[PDB]
Each structure stands twice: as structure tokens, then as C-alpha cells.
Structure 1
Amino acid sequence: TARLQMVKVLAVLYDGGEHAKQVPGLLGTTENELGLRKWLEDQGHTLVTTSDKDREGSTFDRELEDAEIIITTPFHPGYLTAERLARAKKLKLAVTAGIGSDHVDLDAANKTNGGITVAEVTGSCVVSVAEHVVMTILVLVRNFVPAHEQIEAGRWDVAEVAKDEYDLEGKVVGTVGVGRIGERVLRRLKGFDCKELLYYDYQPLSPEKEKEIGCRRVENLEEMLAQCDVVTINCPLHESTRGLFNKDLISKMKRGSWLVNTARGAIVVKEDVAEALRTGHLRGYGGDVWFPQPAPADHVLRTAKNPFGGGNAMVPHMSGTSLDAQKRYAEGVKRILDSYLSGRFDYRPEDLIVHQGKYATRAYGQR
């Protein structure tokens, strides 16, 4: 089979600056280019890399017009809007360096240049995120953030921070989505002796996995939320999950509950989370995802607090770009690129989000 020739690749990655020289394991940066440059150039392909992706007349906007392959990364996402896809005359393959391709307009992608392939590195980040979720759950439940702030400020008052400190043992935790991340969340929670582990997903766990992990499927999302002390969101962003966690749905959670979101920022309504924390309906909110990204400097969830001055465990979009994750998605991006550039188009099916004008996943809504 004849290899494709002189393919223009465009990568939109985050700037590593000095950090990417201190730590060469920052592969997914404009400096280190996922370790792809020599590999592409030796085949006669070209690579243009940028972090300039937002402003009118950005490098991304100029370069996407004749790029055949566009590599994006969720942590600093080149948003492939319908407007931009309509100008991407040569685009055949959009690869996500990581997991979650919702920064691409997938419906528009299906109608672009005969239907472009949108692929991501399935599995590459999922342990990383699951760990981050259990971390965040513990941080919130155990009231870590204001306790650490008290120490660094030179103060000492045990009651002040113990008054909102609980154990995770004996609490009910529910996951929205029991895919590769949600399942691995429940597998990490098993040893904590939660009162119950619940899930809501239109794609269920097998009975054997339910028994092995020790968890129960709840058929109705609102019924799950009403029983949970902790809720974690582990579903993709698609039309039916955008703004899902609005004031009305959050009001179904228990008063004083904890909400974690390492999925996608746009699944929650940021003002509704901030208001629920402000009135004490939520005890805490945390995770690493925002909409848009970079998160605006004034984004309300940078500084929103519960009525006691805690309950915020937000970080930048980092869980899936741990140094261990980056090695896996850099290798996976090379693998997806080789499937295309070889002319084989022999993608792993689980890497495909849209392909040949159709959705190629069950996980972006019931279709």
C-alpha cells in the first residue's frame, strides 16, 4: 500500500517555556512537539506547531487552511468550530493528544471534506484522571484546602477546619458515566468502604464487574443525585451533557454534598455551581476542567467558596497531562499518525470519535 507524501501537520499545544527544558517529560508542549518532528520530517512530512489559537488572525487560524492533519490537545484546545472547519480545505484527520474531542464540532466534522476522521488516544489518560477524582473527593470531604491555608498563614485552630472535616468511609459516591474513567474511579474507591458506590450510564457495567467492584446501577440521574453524598462527573461533553449540571439538577443533590468534575467544564453551569456553594447547598466543588480554556482570569470558579471559606479544589487542566500520561498519549498520537500516513487507515476502533461522515462511538450520546 502506497504511503501518503509531503503531508502538512499542524499541532496546537501548550507553551512549556523554561519548564519544558527543566523537565523534558513535558512532551505535549510546543517545545517538544510530542517527540514527532524528526519522525515526520524523515518521511518528507512537515510540522508547524503553535500555542497561538484564540485571537482573530491567530497562527492556528492561518495554518489550519492547508493543514492535512491537525493535532490538538484538550489542556490547550484549538477549537475546531464550524467556521474554522469550513476554511480547513485540506483537513482529513484531527487527532486529540489526550482524551475528549468536544473542542471539535463533530457534527460539522462529519460534513467537512467528505467527513474527516476525528481520533483520540483512548485509555491514555484514564488512570491519571481517576486518581485525580479520588484525590479531589478526599481533599473536599476532609476539608484540606482551608486547613493547608491556615498552616501557611501561621495560624492554628483545629476546630475551625475540623468542623467541615468528614471521613469518606460511610458516604455514598455516585459517578455520572462508568466508562474507562468512571469504572477506574469506583475501583479506587472500593478500598475506602463507602456506604455505596453508584453509577448512572446508558452503557452499563457487566453484572460481573458490578459484583467485582461492588457497585449498583441507578436508572434515573436525579434519583442517583438524591442518594449521594459525593457526585463525580465522568462523561464526555456532547449536546445532552452541555449545561447538564444546572441549578435545577444541582438542587437534586443533597444539601452539603460534594461535586467533582474532571470531565469537561461546560457540563456544569459555572454560575449555578458558584451559587450552590455560596448558599451552602454544595459543601465543595473541584476538578481541573473549565470552559473555555485557558480559563479566563476572572472565571467565577477560581475563587468561589462555601460559606465557611473552603470548598474549592480547582486546578488548571492538568490531570490527563501528568508526566506519566504524556508518555502514553505521545506514543498513541504517533500510532494514529502512522495509521493515516501509511495509507492503511488501520486505526484502533476505540480511538475513533467520527470517521467517514458518521459517529464511530456510543459514548457521545445515544444515537
Structure 2
Amino acid sequence: AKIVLVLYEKLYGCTENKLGIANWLKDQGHELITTSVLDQHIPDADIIITTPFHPAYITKERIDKAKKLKLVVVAGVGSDHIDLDYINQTGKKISVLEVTGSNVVSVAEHVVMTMLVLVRNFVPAHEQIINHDWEVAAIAKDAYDIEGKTIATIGAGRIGYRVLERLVPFNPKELLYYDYQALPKDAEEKVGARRVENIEELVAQADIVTVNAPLHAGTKGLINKELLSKFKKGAWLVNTARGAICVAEDVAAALESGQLRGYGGDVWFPQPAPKDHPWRDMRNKYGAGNAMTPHYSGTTLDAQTRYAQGTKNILESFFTGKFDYRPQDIILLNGEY
């Protein structure tokens, strides 16, 4: 097989380290093309490996030109950059696989981290120290405990549920969720969560809201002026799902107005964020309430180790012709959903 790897020492998901699989592949007798050129090699690539952290767009055109293409692998989780409906439509026997579950703990941790950072007002506290100041009242006047807060998640899938699990020992007043399906009843009692049936009702009673839902027509621009006006005044909002779920200027406006006390997360639209993106400079009235990071929560070194191993497991299932894939990793199995 000819394999095209698109990226950008426990680092793996960069074009210098090659998922740590460069030798794993050559000593199996394969040719590895690693790039950050790709269009040169698509006509004869049997396999294309991508990363959601520097996504190569597997467009309609590229699919067309890929006459040998049998397999696209996402070394991580997220297929937004692959034209899956087109592959499906073509009738071509192209499998698309991802390392389902490899990102979830990492992002769930990031969410809880961000909540604590916003709630406890960590950002301006640390900024005082490094700027050689000390004024405790300036920090404490907007520092709260996460204990006693009502916390709501929009989406209770793999990431959202793991968020709830990590919140349980923090003694929130209550954990709430909105989703398109019920959590299995045992799973629900294990975190003490209560399902709320509509989004407006959910956000109205929440001190902290976290967005853990797929981007689709239903969630695109979901967090807009109108919805934000139904949040508790002074709520904290975290989003590590997708940038496009929020209306960027609407969020910034709600933070400046005090509708939100804080906003944080590591997802942006457009991404990578323009130098001028409103979420870089937005602050609450106290000059804080911003816990934005670049999109990295799922590229910790521990995550990368899981992506590397998972990519090998997928490749081995393909090379052997066993196709003994994990049901959960399959996005398309020979063009089929």
C-alpha cells in the first residue's frame, strides 16, 4: 500500500514525528508519504491518514482523483473535513475510520478545567502575580466556588457524560442535561443528572452551561443573541464542541454586557482564529471572564498516544484484509454508513 500522511517525541501528530508509525509501516513493507504535494500522491494512494488538528480537506475533487483510494483514517476524532456524503454517493468502496473515544477524556478534562478557571477567576489572579501586583479584593470580588452551582450540558454523549462524571464530587447544586436521547437510566442516576426537555428552559436555570454537542443544522448558531438573553445573568459558558455553535459577536456582546460572567473553550469559527477574532479581546466589565485557548484540548501527549495506537489498530485491520474494525470507529464501511 501507498500511504499518504497529512499532519502539521511523545508528540506524534506532527509531520516530523509521523504518528510514531514511520518505521512500523516501512518494516511492514509500505511506502509512507508524509506531508503538511498531497495532490501529487492522491491518484495512487491506497490509504490517506488525516488529523482533525490540521485537517486536509478530502474534497469531492480529491475523491474523484483518488483512483486507488480504499481507506481514509482520522488519527483522532472528527471528520468535518471529509466529504462523507460524496463518498457515500459515489458507490466507491472507501472506508472512513476514526479513533472513536480517544479524545473524550482529554476534552472532558478541558471542560472542567475551564469551568473552574472561569468560576474561580483564575486568569486575572495569575495575571496579577506575573505583573508584580497583589490586590486580593480585585480577584475575590468575582471568584466563586463551583460547589453549589447548577451546571447544565448541551449534549450528554461521550464527552458531555464524562464532564458530568467529573463534576459529581464537586457537589454542584444539580447537574442537568439536554440531548436528543435519554441517558440510559443507570448512567443518569450515577451522576444524579436530570434531563431538561428544551434548551431555553435548560439555560434559564443554569449557573454554568457547557456545550458538548455535534455541529449540525440544529446546533449551528444555536448560541445567539436571543438564546443568550435567556441565560441567567452572570452565567459562565464553556464550549469545546464547535465554534459555529455560537454566534461569535453575540457571545462577545453578552460577556461585555454582563449577560455572561465568563466564556471559555478551545473551539473557534473560523478556525484557526484570525488575529482579529472578537473572542481574543473580549472581556467582562472587570477585564476578565475570558478562558479561551487555541484548539488543543484533544492533542495532549496522552491523547496522541491513543491516536497513534488506534491508527495502527485500524491499519492492521485493513492490511490483513480482516477488516475487524471496532464498530465505534467506523464512519463509512466501504462507502456505507
1:115 Cα shift? 5.4
Name 2:11's counterpart in structure 1.
Answer: 26
Q: Amino acid of the residue matched to residue 26 of structure 1?
A: L
1:119 aligns with 2:119: no
1:11 aligns with 2:5: yes
CA distance in 2, matches of 1:88, 1:275: 45
Name 2:26's counterpart in structure 1.
Answer: 41
1:336 aligns with 2:334: no
Q: Percent identity?
A: 64
CA distance in 2, matches of 1:240, 1:247: 16
1:82 Cα shift? 3.2
Between stretches 114-123 and 170-179, larger displacement belongs to 114-123
CA distance in 1, matches of 2:67, 2:141: 59
Unaligned runs of 5+ in 1: 1-6, 15-23, 52-58, 360-367
1:236 Cα shift? 2.3
On the 8 A contact 1:76/1:293 being kept in 2, the answer is no
Give the superposed CA RMSD.
1.8
Residues 212-234 of structure 1, C-alpha deviation per residue, up to 9 Å, x if partnerless? Answer: 21111112122111111111111
How do residues 131-150 of structure 1 correspond to structure 2 at under 5 angstroms?
131-150=109-128
Between stretches 60-69 and 249-258, larger displacement belongs to 60-69
On the 8 A contact 2:70/2:94 being kept in 1, the answer is yes
1:169 Cα shift? 1.0
Pair 66,254 (structure 1): closer, same or farther in 2 beyond 3 Å: farther
1:63 aligns with 2:57: no
1:105 Cα shift? 2.6
On the 8 A contact 1:92/1:113 being kept in 2, the answer is no
SS at 2:44's partner residue?
A: coil
CA distance in 2, matches of 1:220, 1:271: 24
SS at 1:240's partner residue?
A: coil
Return structure 1 stretches of 4+ with deviation > 4 angstroms: none
SS at 1:325's partner residue?
A: helix
Q: Amino acid of the residue matched to residue 236 of structure 2?
A: W
Name 1:205's counterpart in structure 2.
Answer: 183
Unaligned runs of 5+ in 2: none
On the 8 A contact 2:91/2:335 being kept in 1, the answer is no
CA distance in 2, matches of 1:218, 1:257: 18
1:350 Cα shift? 0.5
SS at 1:64's partner residue?
A: helix
SS at 1:140's partner residue?
A: helix
How do residues 299-314 of structure 1 correspond to structure 2 at under 5 angstroms?
299-314=277-292
On the 8 A contact 1:94/1:117 being kept in 2, the answer is yes
CA distance in 1, matches of 2:137, 2:61: 55
State the TM-score, normalizing by the size of structure 1: 0.86
CA distance in 2, matches of 1:50, 1:239: 33
Residues 230-285 of structure 1, C-alpha deviation per residue, up to 9 Å, x if partnerless? Answer: 11111223343332222223333222111111112222222222222222211111
SS at 1:25's partner residue?
A: coil
1:278 aligns with 2:263: no
SS at 1:26's partner residue?
A: coil
Q: Amino acid of the residue matched to residue 170 of structure 2?
A: F
CA distance in 1, matches of 2:273, 2:40: 23
Count of aligned residue pairs for this structure pair: 337
1:226 aligns with 2:211: no
Name 1:186's counterpart in structure 2.
Answer: 164
